[PDB]
Short mmCIF file of C-alpha atoms and ligand atoms in Angstrom, two decimals:
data_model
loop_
_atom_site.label_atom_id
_atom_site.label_comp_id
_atom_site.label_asym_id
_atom_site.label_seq_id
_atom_site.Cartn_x
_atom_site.Cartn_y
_atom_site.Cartn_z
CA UNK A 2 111.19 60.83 31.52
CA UNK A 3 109.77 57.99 33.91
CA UNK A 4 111.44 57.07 37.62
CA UNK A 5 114.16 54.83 37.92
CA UNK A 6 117.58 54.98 39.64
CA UNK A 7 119.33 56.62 37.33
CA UNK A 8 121.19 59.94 37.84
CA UNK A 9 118.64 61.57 35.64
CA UNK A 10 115.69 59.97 36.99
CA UNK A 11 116.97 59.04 40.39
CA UNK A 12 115.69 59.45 43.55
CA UNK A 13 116.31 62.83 44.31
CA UNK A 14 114.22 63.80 40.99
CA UNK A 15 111.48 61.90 42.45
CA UNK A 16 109.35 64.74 44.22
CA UNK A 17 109.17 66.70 41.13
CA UNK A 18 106.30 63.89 40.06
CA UNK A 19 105.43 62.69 43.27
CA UNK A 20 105.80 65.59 45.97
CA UNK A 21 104.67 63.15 48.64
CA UNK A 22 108.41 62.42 48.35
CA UNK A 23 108.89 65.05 51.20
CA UNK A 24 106.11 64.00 52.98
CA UNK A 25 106.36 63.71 57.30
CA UNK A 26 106.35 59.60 56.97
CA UNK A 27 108.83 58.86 54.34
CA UNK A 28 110.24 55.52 53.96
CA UNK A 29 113.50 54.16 54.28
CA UNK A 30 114.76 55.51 57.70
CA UNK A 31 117.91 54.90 59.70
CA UNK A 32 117.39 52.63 62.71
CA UNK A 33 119.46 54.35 65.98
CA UNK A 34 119.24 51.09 67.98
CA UNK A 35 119.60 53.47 70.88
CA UNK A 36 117.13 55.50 70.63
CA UNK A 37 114.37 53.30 69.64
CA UNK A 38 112.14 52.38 72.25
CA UNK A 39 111.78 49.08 74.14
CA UNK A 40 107.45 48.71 73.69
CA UNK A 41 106.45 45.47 75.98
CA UNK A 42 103.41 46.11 74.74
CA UNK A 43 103.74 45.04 71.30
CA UNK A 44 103.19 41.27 70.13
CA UNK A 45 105.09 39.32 68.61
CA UNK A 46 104.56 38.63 64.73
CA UNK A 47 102.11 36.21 63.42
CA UNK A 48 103.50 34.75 60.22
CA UNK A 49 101.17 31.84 58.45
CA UNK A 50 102.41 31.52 55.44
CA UNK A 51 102.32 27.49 55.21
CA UNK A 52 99.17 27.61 52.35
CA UNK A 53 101.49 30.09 50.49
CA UNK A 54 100.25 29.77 46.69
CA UNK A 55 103.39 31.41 44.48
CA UNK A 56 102.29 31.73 40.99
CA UNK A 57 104.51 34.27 39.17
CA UNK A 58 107.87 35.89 38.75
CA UNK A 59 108.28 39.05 36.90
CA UNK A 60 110.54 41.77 36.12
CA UNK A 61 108.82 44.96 36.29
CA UNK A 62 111.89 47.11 35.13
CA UNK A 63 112.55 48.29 38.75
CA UNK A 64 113.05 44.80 40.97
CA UNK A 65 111.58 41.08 40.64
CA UNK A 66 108.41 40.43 42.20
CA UNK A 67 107.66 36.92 42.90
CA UNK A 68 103.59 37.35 43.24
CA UNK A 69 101.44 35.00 45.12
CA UNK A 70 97.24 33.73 45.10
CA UNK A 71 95.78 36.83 47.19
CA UNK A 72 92.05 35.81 47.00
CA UNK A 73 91.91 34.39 50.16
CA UNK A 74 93.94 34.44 53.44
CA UNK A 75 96.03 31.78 52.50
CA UNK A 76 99.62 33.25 53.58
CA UNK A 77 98.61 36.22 56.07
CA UNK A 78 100.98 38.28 59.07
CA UNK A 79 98.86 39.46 61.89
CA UNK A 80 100.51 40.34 65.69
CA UNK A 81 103.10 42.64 66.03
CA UNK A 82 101.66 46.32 65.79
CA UNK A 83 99.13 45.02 63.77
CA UNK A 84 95.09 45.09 64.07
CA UNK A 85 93.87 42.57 61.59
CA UNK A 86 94.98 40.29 58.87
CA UNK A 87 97.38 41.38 56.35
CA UNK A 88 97.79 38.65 52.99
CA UNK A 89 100.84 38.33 51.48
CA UNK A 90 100.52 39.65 47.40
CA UNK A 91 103.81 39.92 46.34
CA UNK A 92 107.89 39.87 47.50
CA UNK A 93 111.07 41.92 45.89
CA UNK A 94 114.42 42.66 46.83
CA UNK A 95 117.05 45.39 46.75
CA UNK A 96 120.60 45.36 45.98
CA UNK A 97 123.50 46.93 45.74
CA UNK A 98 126.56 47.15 42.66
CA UNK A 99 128.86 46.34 45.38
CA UNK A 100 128.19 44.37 48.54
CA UNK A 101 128.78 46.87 50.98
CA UNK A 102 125.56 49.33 50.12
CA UNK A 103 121.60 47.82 48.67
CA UNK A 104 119.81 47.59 51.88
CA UNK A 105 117.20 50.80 52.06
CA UNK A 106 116.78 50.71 55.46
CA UNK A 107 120.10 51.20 58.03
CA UNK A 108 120.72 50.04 61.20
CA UNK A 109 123.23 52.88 63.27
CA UNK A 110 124.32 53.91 59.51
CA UNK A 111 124.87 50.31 58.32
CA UNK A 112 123.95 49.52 54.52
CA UNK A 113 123.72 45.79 54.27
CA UNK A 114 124.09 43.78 50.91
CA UNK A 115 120.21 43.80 50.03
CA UNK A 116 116.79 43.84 51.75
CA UNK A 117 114.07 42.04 51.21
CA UNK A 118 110.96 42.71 51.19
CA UNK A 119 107.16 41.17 51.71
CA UNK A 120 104.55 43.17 51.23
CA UNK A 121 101.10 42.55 52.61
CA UNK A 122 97.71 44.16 52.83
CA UNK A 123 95.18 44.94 54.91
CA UNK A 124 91.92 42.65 54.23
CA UNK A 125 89.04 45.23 55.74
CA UNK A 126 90.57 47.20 52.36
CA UNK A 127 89.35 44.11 49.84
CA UNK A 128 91.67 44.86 47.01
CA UNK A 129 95.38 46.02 47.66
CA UNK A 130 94.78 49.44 45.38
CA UNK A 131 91.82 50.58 48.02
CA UNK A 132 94.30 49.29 50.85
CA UNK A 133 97.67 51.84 49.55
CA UNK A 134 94.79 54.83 49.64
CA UNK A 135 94.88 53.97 53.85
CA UNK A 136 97.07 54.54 57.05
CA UNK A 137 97.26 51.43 58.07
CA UNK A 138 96.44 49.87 54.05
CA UNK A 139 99.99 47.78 53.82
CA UNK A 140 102.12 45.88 56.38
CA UNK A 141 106.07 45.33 54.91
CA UNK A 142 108.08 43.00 56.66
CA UNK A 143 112.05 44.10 55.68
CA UNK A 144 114.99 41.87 55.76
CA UNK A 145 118.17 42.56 55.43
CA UNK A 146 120.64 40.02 53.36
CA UNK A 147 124.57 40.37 54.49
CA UNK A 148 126.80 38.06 52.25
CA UNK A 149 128.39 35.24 53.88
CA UNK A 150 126.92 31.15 53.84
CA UNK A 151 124.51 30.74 50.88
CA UNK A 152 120.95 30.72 51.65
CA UNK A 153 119.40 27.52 50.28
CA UNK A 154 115.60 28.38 50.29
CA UNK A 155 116.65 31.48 47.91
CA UNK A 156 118.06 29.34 45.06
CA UNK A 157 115.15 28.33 43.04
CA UNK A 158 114.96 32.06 42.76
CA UNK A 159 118.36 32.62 41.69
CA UNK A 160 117.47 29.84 39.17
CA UNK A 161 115.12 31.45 37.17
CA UNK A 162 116.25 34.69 36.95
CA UNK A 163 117.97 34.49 33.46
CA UNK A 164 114.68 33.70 32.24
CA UNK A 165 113.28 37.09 33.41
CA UNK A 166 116.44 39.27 32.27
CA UNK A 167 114.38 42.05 31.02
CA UNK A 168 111.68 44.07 31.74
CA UNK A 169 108.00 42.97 31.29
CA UNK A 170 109.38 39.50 31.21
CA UNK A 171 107.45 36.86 33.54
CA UNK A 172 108.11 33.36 34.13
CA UNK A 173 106.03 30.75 36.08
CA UNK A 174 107.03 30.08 39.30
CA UNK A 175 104.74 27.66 41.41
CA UNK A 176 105.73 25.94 44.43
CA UNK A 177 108.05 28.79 46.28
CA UNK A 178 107.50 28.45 50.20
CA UNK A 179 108.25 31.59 51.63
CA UNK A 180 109.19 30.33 54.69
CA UNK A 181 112.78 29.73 53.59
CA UNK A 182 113.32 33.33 53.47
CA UNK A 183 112.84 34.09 57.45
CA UNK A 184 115.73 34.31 60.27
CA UNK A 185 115.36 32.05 62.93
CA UNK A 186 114.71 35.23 64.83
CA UNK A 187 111.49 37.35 64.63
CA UNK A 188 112.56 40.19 66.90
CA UNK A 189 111.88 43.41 65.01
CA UNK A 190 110.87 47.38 64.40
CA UNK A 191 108.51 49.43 64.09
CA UNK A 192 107.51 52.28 62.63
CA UNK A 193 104.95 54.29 60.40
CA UNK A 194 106.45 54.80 56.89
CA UNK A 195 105.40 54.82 52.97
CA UNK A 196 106.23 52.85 50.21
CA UNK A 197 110.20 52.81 48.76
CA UNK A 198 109.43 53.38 45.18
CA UNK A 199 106.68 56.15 43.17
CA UNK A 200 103.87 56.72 43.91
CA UNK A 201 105.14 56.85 47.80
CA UNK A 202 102.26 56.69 49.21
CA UNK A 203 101.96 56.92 52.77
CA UNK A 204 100.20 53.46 54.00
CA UNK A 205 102.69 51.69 55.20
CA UNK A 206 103.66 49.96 58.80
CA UNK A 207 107.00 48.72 58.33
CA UNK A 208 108.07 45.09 60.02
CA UNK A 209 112.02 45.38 60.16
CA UNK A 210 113.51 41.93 61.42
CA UNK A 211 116.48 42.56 63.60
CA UNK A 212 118.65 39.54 62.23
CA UNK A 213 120.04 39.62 58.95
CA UNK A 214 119.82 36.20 56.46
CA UNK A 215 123.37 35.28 54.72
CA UNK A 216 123.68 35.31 51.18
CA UNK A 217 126.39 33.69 49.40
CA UNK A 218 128.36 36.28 47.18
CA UNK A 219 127.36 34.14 43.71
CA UNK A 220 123.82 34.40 44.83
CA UNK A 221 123.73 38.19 44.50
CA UNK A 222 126.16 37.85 41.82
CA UNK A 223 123.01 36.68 39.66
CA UNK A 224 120.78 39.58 41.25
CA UNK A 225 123.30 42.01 39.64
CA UNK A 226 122.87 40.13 35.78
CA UNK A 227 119.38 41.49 35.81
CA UNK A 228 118.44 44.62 33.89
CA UNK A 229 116.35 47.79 34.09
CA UNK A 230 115.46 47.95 29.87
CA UNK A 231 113.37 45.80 27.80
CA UNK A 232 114.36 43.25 25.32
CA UNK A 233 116.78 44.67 22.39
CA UNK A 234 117.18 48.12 24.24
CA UNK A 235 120.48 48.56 25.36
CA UNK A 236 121.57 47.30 28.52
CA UNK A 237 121.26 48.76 31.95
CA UNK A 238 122.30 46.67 34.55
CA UNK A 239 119.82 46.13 37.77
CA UNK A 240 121.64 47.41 40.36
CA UNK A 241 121.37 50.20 43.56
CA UNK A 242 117.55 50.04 42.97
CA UNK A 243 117.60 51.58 46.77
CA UNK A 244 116.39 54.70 47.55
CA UNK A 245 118.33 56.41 50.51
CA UNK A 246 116.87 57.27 54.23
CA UNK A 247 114.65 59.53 54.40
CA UNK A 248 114.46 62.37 57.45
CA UNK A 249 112.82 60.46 60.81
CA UNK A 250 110.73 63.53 61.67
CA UNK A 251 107.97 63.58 63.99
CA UNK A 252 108.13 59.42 64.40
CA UNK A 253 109.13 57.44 67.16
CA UNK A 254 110.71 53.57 66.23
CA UNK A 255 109.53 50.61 68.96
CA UNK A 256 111.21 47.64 69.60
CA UNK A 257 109.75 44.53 70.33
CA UNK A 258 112.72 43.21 72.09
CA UNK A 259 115.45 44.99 74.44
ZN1 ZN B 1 110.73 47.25 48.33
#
């Protein structure tokens, strides 16, 4: 039947649908912080995100999206490895059953708690489904959450989620600043990758922030009270929505930092 992360429907059924799935720039990768490359060359990240319009959260049956006003550059990245302006559409997180695996992305084999991630596209593109057709269509910046101190600017999240339990539910949510999401650091890397979920297309230039947020163990908690089914279908909890690394291959990852 349809994707999910199921053992029946799983990840590693994936390519039977989708056979970009073993495609030469799959997404998630392991990071080997010692064999990434130091690239002086790259600048540093551009984040303007303080005319950030959130409008919607919803639960899609595979994550939360929190979606935001994309018909203008009101909350854009540019810098970094990027050409152009990239607006924000939409953010989402993974998680894990158990705090010690969620992340998608590793760093030196280490699965952190969740990652989150904002996904932008490319404006030359003019919609987001011409931009996913391109190369250089999306720009995701990752995150990764590690549980410790609670994270204040993710609460009003937490909030709402039990009014978005199930799938195709949707809930207002006006207001959200972004901002409160980011480390104080914006030291990343880079590398070209796809999306993490069907159709895994191929249009992606990943934006992996070196330092980890803190979540408080309650906050995920109420990640882990969401579920994959719709209303009156029995329950499948929303967790390990995180599909494993992928082979590296013929790609080289830069760091903006040493
Ligand atoms: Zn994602």
């Amino acid at each position: 039947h349809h994707w999910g992360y199921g053992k029946h429907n799983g990840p590693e059924h994936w390519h039977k649908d989708f056979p970009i799935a073993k495609g030469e720039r799959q997404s998630p990768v392991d990071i080997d912080t010692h064999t990434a490359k130091y690239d002086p060359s790259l600048k540093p990240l551009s984040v303007s995100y303080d005319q950030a319009t959130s409008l919607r959260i919803l639960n899609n049956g595979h994550a939360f999206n929190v979606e935001f006003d994309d018909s203008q550059d009101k909350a854009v990245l540019k810098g970094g490895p990027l050409d152009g302006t990239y607006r924000l559409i939409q953010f989402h997180f993974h998680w894990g059953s158990l705090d010690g695996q969620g992340s998608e992305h590793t760093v030196d084999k280490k699965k952190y708690a969740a990652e989150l991630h904002l996904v932008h596209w490319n404006t030359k593109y003019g919609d987001f489904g011409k931009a996913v057709q391109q190369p250089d269509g999306l720009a995701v910046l990752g995150i990764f959450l590690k549980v410790g101190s609670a994270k204040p600017g993710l609460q009003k999240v937490v909030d709402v989620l039990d009014s978005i339990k199930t799938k195709g539910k949707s809930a207002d949510f006006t207001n959200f600043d972004p901002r409160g999401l980011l480390p104080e650091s914006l030291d990343y890397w880079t590398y070209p990758g796809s999306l993490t979920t069907p159709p895994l297309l191929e249009c992606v230039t990943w934006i992996v922030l070196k330092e980890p947020i803190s979540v408080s163990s309650e906050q995920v908690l109420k990640f882990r009270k969401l579920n994959f089914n719709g209303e009156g279908e029995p329950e499948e909890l929303m967790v390990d929505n995180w599909r494993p690394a992928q082979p590296l291959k013929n790609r080289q990852i830069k760091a903006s930092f040493k």
